[PDB]
Amino acid sequence: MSEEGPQVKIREASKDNVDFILSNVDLAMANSLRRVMIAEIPTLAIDSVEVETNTTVLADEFIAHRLGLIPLQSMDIEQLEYSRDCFCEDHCDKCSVVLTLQAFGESESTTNVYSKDLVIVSNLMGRNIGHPIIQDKEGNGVLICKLRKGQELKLTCVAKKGIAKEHAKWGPAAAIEFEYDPWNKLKHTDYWYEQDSAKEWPQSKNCEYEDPPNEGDPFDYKAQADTFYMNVESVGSIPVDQVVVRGIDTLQKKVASILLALTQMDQDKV
Amino acid sequence: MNAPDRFELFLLGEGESKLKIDPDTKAPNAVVITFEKEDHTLGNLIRAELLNDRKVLFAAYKVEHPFFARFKLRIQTTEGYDPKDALKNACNSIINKLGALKTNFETEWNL
Amino acid sequence: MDQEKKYGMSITETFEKPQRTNTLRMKHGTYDKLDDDGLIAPGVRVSGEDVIIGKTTPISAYHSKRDASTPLRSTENGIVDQVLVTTNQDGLKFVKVRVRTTKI
Amino acid sequence: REVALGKTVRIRSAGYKGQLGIVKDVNGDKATVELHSKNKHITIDKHKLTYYNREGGEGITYDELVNRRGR
Amino acid sequence: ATLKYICAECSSKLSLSRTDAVRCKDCGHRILLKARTKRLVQFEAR
Amino acid sequence: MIVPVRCFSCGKVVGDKWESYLNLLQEDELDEGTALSRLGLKRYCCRRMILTHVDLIEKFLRYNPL
Ligand SMILES: [Zn+2]
Ligand SMILES: [Zn+2]
Ligand SMILES: [Zn+2]
């Protein structure tokens, strides 16, 4: 209870999923928040890959794409500057993280290469970034490639900050569930049916949090959408609560930038 | 090869500005504002907040083409009310609502 | 695919890097990507009409040979992944080069 | 005459920072540098881009004119 | 003279001269593959 | 050829569950659907990522390398 505007009510909390109900908010703000959480949060991911030796049965572009799709820790992504905004030549410790991967095939059986084999060689300067995200019980990670005896894979990667709009590999959220008005009280949709509508259409799991419609009642034309049920799932780079906070912060930053541009141009034109 | 670069949809280039207001001669006290490098994310919010105002007689936005990340916003306000003032008020209200939402979410997650 | 043809007895084409001075009628593409043997090593990015195989054949003062290299296709580009060199049935040189590219 | 001809270079600043390519055609001040990963040609100023060795090594600026050599 | 070739059968590294007709030494195979270049190979994961 | 790192539709990381899925299918002795549910995939978009994946990497590795 901070201000009479939007309200929240968390139904479930977890390290990978968060369930909450938005109240006293409009459809536009909820949709903007969903879009920002989908494709606006900065994240650290591998951008450029240098292949030194590749004797495997996989093409260099294949391994580069697979490495670029590997999630990386981005807890302290706010302390890393953009590559284009840096004064260096190509990359440095203050704007990028360098990772090196070396693999060789010694055992007769197939030797798998996992994301845990990546080693950070740059100086993080105490920042909590660059560590590959491991969530498997065995603690192996993402399978990158498989090698047999006599094959070697040596290469070096550099990680750079980016947003999901530029490339899908920078997305921190996997899938976001958005739903409102479990019953058709607002008549925002028409239900396709053959003989019956209630029987043919299954009831949503959120129907228990709202009062069922009363038969023989006039259609409420003064009612708008104000309650939204949202579920956010994180890939693992950023926690779900931090994902939501960063989404709100990014939306606020965009609005503030628009206001600043308007004020600056008003001052210049006057 | 004719693939546009992926950073042209969110990065300002050279010679163009984020905002551009041009007066509209079709109706009195009406202006058209062009936004560069954003679309469909804050335009809907701005239109909704402008419609929430009582001194705004018209508020709409459109995207000419999905290829280019830009949209045009048209605001018509009552006599004596500058559309820029309405835009500033809508932005301030959005900022306040977002801050309140963030504070409430943090408070709820703390427990 | 490229091959060496034995015209007559001593007029045989050779795989080597041509030069603007000794050779005549060179292609408009670049030749720096070639090597001493006239074949580009795998793993080198190529584009446009760059020369991948360097072959020259004698005409019959100076200028005793003319360029006969096969450039890459103008509308295609990629990275060479495997280069194969062997001998044909008679015993001359046989060179095959492969270019790999990804199509999103 | 021009030093920037057939030498591997790295694009600095702009939207292609850190990219690796080889300059093919140079005319006036703008230099056409191809891209390794991307199948496209981008024309940028020769002074902006740094210069590297073909085999590999440290990178240097456009001071190659004074040195009149590579590496 | 410094060119390196790899046999296509036993994968034996070898170097040959211009006057030396292409063939392997650890076996009778006559198919050789050029060694990978030592230049700078950089790929963009994007 | 090899298991994808991320789901095409949403973006869930499914490249770390191939070995677990194989282990569940080969000694835990349950059908594919229950194994997929146990792994943590609830949407069919993620289920199709490993349910209809062919591992051709072994066939390539069968050939003698350099
Ligand atoms: Zn830097
Ligand atoms: Zn051999
Ligand atoms: Zn999925």
UniProtKB/Swiss-Prot annotation, chain B:
Record flagged with keyword Transcription: yes
Any one GO molecular-function label of the UniProt entry: DNA binding
One matching Pfam family: RNA_pol_L_2
Protein name per its UniProtKB record: DNA-directed RNA polymerase II subunit RPB11
Assembly information from the UniProt record: Component of the RNA polymerase II (Pol II) complex consisting of 12 subunits.
Keywords of the record: DNA-directed RNA polymerase, Nucleus, Transcription
Keyword Transcription: yes
A biological process from GO: transcription by RNA polymerase II
Family under the similarity heading: Belongs to the archaeal Rpo11/eukaryotic RPB11/RPC19 RNA polymerase subunit family.
Gene name as annotated: RPB11
Organism for this UniProt entry: Saccharomyces cerevisiae (strain ATCC 204508 / S288c)
Extra remark beyond the main annotation: Present with 4280 molecules/cell in log phase SD medium.
Function: DNA-dependent RNA polymerase catalyzes the transcription of DNA into RNA using the four ribonucleoside triphosphates as substrates. Component of RNA polymerase II which synthesizes mRNA precursors and many functional non-coding RNAs. Pol II is the central component of the basal RNA polymerase II transcription machinery. It is composed of mobile elements that move relative to each other. RPB11 is part of the core element with the central large cleft. Seems to be involved transcript termination.
Curated annotation (Swiss-Prot), chain D:
Subcellular location as annotated: Nucleus; Mitochondrion; Chromosome
Domain of life: Eukaryota
Domain KOW positions: 3-36
Family indicated by similarity: Belongs to the SPT5 family.
Notes concerning its domains: The C-terminal repeats are critical for activity.
Role of this protein: The SPT4-SPT5 complex mediates both activation and inhibition of transcription elongation, and plays a role in pre-mRNA processing. This complex seems to be important for the stability of the RNA polymerase II elongation machinery on the chromatin template but not for the inherent ability of this machinery to translocate down the gene.
Subunit structure: Component of the SPT4-SPT5 complex. Interacts with RNA polymerase II. Interacts with SHE2.
Note: It is phosphorylated in a PKA-dependent manner in vitro. Present with 2340 molecules/cell in log phase SD medium.
Protein's UniProt name: Transcription elongation factor SPT5
From Swiss-Prot, chain E:
Chain positions of all zinc fingers (C4-type): 7-27
Function, as annotated: DNA-dependent RNA polymerases catalyze the transcription of DNA into RNA using the four ribonucleoside triphosphates as substrates. Common component of RNA polymerases I, II and III which synthesize ribosomal RNA precursors, mRNA precursors and many functional non-coding RNAs, and a small RNAs, such as 5S rRNA and tRNAs, respectively. RNA polymerases are composed of mobile elements that move relative to each other. In Pol II, the core element with the central large cleft comprises RPB3, RBP10, RPB11, RPB12 and regions of RPB1 and RPB2 forming the active center.
Assembly and binders: Component of the RNA polymerase I (Pol I), RNA polymerase II (Pol II) and RNA polymerase III (Pol III) complexes. Component of the RNA polymerase I (Pol I) complex consisting of 14 subunits: RPA135, RPA190, RPC40, RPA14, RPB5, RPO26, RPA43, RPB8, RPA12, RPB10, RPC19, RPC10, RPA49 and RPA34. The complex is composed of a horseshoe-shaped core containing ten subunits (RPA135, RPA190, RPB5, RPO26, RPB8, RPB10, RPC10, RPA12, RPC19 and RPC40) where RPA135 and RPA190 form the DNA-binding cleft.
Residues of the full protein shown: 25 to 70 of 70
Miscellaneous: Present with 907 molecules/cell in log phase SD medium.
Gene that this polypeptide is encoded by: RPC10
Taxonomic classification: Eukaryota, Fungi, Dikarya, Ascomycota, Saccharomycotina
Protein name (record): DNA-directed RNA polymerases I, II, and III subunit RPABC4
From Swiss-Prot, chain F:
Biological processes per GO annotation: nucleolar large rRNA transcription by RNA polymerase I; ribosome biogenesis; RNA-templated transcription; termination of RNA polymerase I transcription; termination of RNA polymerase III transcription; transcription by RNA polymerase I; transcription by RNA polymerase II; transcription by RNA polymerase III
Primary subcellular site in the record, as a coarse category: nucleus
Cross-referenced Pfam families: RNA_pol_N
Residues in cross-link Glycyl lysine isopeptide (Lys-Gly) (interchain with G-Cter in ubiquitin): 59
Entry keyword annotation includes Metal-binding: yes
Disulfide bond sites: none
Binding-site residues for Zn(2+), renumbered to this chain: 7, 10, 45-46
Keywords: DNA-directed RNA polymerase, Isopeptide bond, Metal-binding, Nucleus, Ribosome biogenesis, Transcription, Ubl conjugation, Zinc
Subcellular compartments: Nucleus, Nucleolus
PROSITE patterns, sorted: RNA_POL_N_8KD
GO MF: DNA binding; DNA-directed RNA polymerase activity; zinc ion binding
SUPFAM superfamilies the record matches: RNA polymerase subunit RPB10
Cellular compartments per GO CC: nucleoplasm; nucleus; RNA polymerase I complex; RNA polymerase II, core complex; RNA polymerase III complex
Top-level taxon in the UniProt lineage: Eukaryota
Subunit structure: Component of the RNA polymerase I (Pol I), RNA polymerase II (Pol II) and RNA polymerase III (Pol III) complexes. Component of the RNA polymerase I (Pol I) complex consisting of 14 subunits: RPA135, RPA190, RPC40, RPA14, RPB5, RPO26, RPA43, RPB8, RPA12, RPB10, RPC19, RPC10, RPA49 and RPA34. The complex is composed of a horseshoe-shaped core containing ten subunits (RPA135, RPA190, RPB5, RPO26, RPB8, RPB10, RPC10, RPA12, RPC19 and RPC40) where RPA135 and RPA190 form the DNA-binding cleft.
NCBIfam families, per database record: PRK04016.1
